[PDB]
Amino acid sequence: SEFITVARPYAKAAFDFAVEHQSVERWQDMLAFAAEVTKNEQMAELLSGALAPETLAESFIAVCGEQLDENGQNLIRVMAENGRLNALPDVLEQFIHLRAVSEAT
């Protein structure tokens, strides 16, 4: 269960529409806080506990303080459905570069 490659598209696919609805601005926080909790010793074990994505899917969006719009809840479940919801930072680093590319042309 280590599809690190899934974070590359996640950071972009989640950014593609985040730009059309002008979410990118407030959306940056959601990914920043999400990527920060996934790389947290206690949260890391909680996420990689079993094959069931539900235990880590709702647990993640909840520990964030329910501050995630519809896409924040849809992404964490799909990310967990692929057995790699803990790869939030794997997408964050990719997303930060997408902003630089959008903030350049």
């Binding site: 590359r8 598209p9 696919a13 529409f17 896409n71 692929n82």
Partner: peptide
């Protein structure tokens, strides 16, 4: 290339913004 996790981007774009809307 479209076949490995890197191509799921379009599938993600449809689910990340429209997961519970099918």
């Amino acid at each position: 290339m479209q076949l490995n996790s890197t191509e799921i981007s379009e599938l993600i774009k449809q689910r990340i913004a429209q997961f519970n809307v099918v």
